Structure 1
Amino acid sequence: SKPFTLPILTLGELTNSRFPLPIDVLYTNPNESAIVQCQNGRCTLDGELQGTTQLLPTGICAFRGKVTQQVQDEHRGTHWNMTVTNLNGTPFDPTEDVPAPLGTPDFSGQIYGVISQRNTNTVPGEGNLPANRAHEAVIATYSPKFTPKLGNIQFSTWETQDVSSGQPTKFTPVGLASVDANSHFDQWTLPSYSGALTLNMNLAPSVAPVFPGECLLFFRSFIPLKGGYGNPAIDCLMPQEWVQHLYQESAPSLSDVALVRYVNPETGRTLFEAKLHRNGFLTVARNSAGPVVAPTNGYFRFDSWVNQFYTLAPM
């Protein structure tokens, strides 16, 4: 059996698997009441991608498709419907056993970014080159019109008219539009992928500590805002480089729990230890919420396969 390994990357060399952001800090929140069941950044230790997880950092919270038409919506702004394909441009087949096209956002909120278009049709006078446009845009993932599993979503723009029907369209995510109460930001609330009143399917399972005294450990990034007050964050279970590494290696999991040590390169010492679980998440023995205050040159080193009855040294 191929030996299990993690990449050798300090925190400052890792990126979030749930939004295109660098990892800023490690983080715990033991008293979290929500069920933790994110769909991006989901990969087993033996390399099986789950939920809506795909490998490209550029694909996380991205969409590709075509605008159909401007549409009416009660909310302010100018609204547009777009069909969505797979990120590789092939038609999304709703009979595949995934919750939504891979890369689809996995949380409730107003995702701010840029919609860009490059026309299919070309002009001989322009050297046979297509016309283009891009504009800031917001995708409300809690909207009844957010139906990526049905192959269509809606976005809104400040721009009132310069979005073209029937043309190839890309959404590049940048941040959140707002985190006011009215903007329904909740990182642990899944979108309804097929719309209002429908049940999501094919989900990666929820994650939780099972051993007393343990809590989830997250890789946290702070997410930009278009406006308003706030310091919002997105917490992932494993960074995108771990997803990429595990997928590559596909090493057999020799037990249900790997023991890992967070180590300082300069000192050589272990700052704390953690359980890395088979389904792809970490727990630590810690009784507080907030950041883990440690150097960003620190990294996780795989020590050995253990089991659920292993007692972690307290942080």
Structure 2
Amino acid sequence: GSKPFTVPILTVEEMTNSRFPIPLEKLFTGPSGAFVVQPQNGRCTTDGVLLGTTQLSPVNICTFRGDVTHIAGSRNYTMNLASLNWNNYDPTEEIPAPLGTPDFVGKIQGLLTQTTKGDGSTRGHKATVYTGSAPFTPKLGSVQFSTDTENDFETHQNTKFTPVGVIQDGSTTHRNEPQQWVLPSYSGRNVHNVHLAPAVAPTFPGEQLLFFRSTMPGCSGYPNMDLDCLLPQEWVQHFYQEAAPAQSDVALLRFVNPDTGRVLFECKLHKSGYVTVAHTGQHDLVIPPNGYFRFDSWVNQFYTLAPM
């Protein structure tokens, strides 16, 4: 008597990255035994429980909201954060950081915009947040932005950060940042992160994670623009609504080609919200534009996949 489980029939290129507000481009698999894979956005169980800092909006990912204060002698501003819905932020909520907070170390550039309530005057400036920096303390309710102005922003007026892309210091090794698999210190460098969505890894020999991959825009230097999420944002929204019970640890999915009527490959969708495939090595999957995932049956962690 369990509600039947399903995944969306949207194709990969019809879906959105859950870790940055950009479209998916491709599927990628590679080894990740050497390091911890623990993203906090795009985390959701198959029965619809949001984890980490995951929230439902594709466009709220890596945004910030609040009001700002200027740092004299600079073009830097401190943002005192509001909640996702512009109310008072509560640091004691059982989350790692405000929902939608970036979950990787990098220099994220976008625009800081503001409206003055009284007359509806507005202003917007290019701005960058360094999520690896000492003032990056979103869990404690504040982050710092570098901007292109020393005086234009007003205090105590609603201010929004909209992300666009990432930058790198071109005097250093190319593509050495961002580091998408390094979590920020949400409460600052001397404080451990809390309430995290768990790290994920394949346990089965010869299996690797299957990533939903995008390329982040670059705004300066030579950044590493690869960005891999565990679930498309549309899958997060789907499971959240459906809330179908997980009848076992693992949902077997087949990736189907409607142009031939044949299955390209099969994969495991684990109930805690990630996908694995039977393959060894780094590989950009080549898929038909009309290809889609289809849930076929509940299996478990001991199931042997056909090689990808």
TM range, smaller chain: over 0.9
| CA-to-aligned-CA distance 1:187-229 (integer Å, 9 cap, x gap) | 0100011112110000000000011000000000000011223
Matching residue's letter, 2:153 = V
Shift in Å at residue 16 of structure 1? 0.2
Is 1:68 the counterpart of 2:58 in the alignment? no
Question: What is the 5 A alignment of 1:1-315?
Answer: 1-31=2-32, 33-71=34-72, 78-122=75-119, 130-178=120-168, 180=170, 181=172, 184-230=177-223, 232-315=225-308
Shift in Å at residue 178 of structure 1? 2.1
Secondary structure at the aligned position of 1:263 is classed as strand
Matching residue's letter, 1:70 = I
Q: Which is further off, 77-86 or 97-106? A: 77-86
Q: Which is further off, 88-97 or 18-27? A: 88-97
Q: Which is further off, 287-296 or 168-177? A: 287-296
The CA distance in 1 between the partners of 2:222 and 2:98, in whole Å, is 32
Matching residue's letter, 1:242 = W
The CA distance in 2 between the partners of 1:293 and 1:67, in whole Å, is 46
CA contact (8 A) 1:12 1:297 kept: no
Shift in Å at residue 230 of structure 1? 4.4
Shift in Å at residue 299 of structure 1? 1.1
Identity %: 58
Matching residue's letter, 1:141 = T
Shift in Å at residue 28 of structure 1? 1.1
Q: Which is further off, 290-299 or 203-212? A: 290-299
The CA distance in 2 between the partners of 1:7 and 1:53, in whole Å, is 19
CA contact (8 A) 1:10 1:296 kept: yes
**C-alpha distance 293-71 of structure 1, shift in aligned 2 (>3 A):** farther
Matching residue's letter, 1:25 = K
CA contact (8 A) 1:179 1:232 kept: no
- Cα RMSD after superposing both structures: 1.5
Matching residue's letter, 1:196 = R
Secondary structure at the aligned position of 2:28 is classed as strand
**1:125 maps to which residue?**
none
CA contact (8 A) 2:104 2:181 kept: yes
Secondary structure at the aligned position of 2:235 is classed as helix
The CA distance in 1 between the partners of 2:279 and 2:82, in whole Å, is 43
The CA distance in 1 between the partners of 2:32 and 2:137, in whole Å, is 32
Matching residue's letter, 2:16 = T
The CA distance in 2 between the partners of 1:164 and 1:230, in whole Å, is 32
Secondary structure at the aligned position of 2:22 is classed as coil
| CA-to-aligned-CA distance 1:236-262 (integer Å, 9 cap, x gap) | 000000000000000000000000011
Runs of 4+ aligned structure 1 residues displaced above 6 Å come to none
Matching residue's letter, 2:55 = Q
Q: So what's the TM-score if we normalise by structure 1?
A: 0.93
Shift in Å at residue 69 of structure 1? 2.4
CA contact (8 A) 1:264 1:297 kept: yes
CA contact (8 A) 1:257 1:306 kept: yes
Shift in Å at residue 30 of structure 1? 1.1
| CA-to-aligned-CA distance 1:241-288 (integer Å, 9 cap, x gap) | 000000000000000000001111222211000000011000000112
**1:126 maps to which residue?**
none
| CA-to-aligned-CA distance 1:47-104 (integer Å, 9 cap, x gap) | 00000000011110011100122356xxxx6210011111111212111100001000
Shift in Å at residue 31 of structure 1? 4.7
CA contact (8 A) 1:148 1:193 kept: yes
How many residue pairs were aligned?
Answer: 304
Structure 1 unaligned segments of length 5 or more: list them: 123-129
Matching residue's letter, 1:55 = L
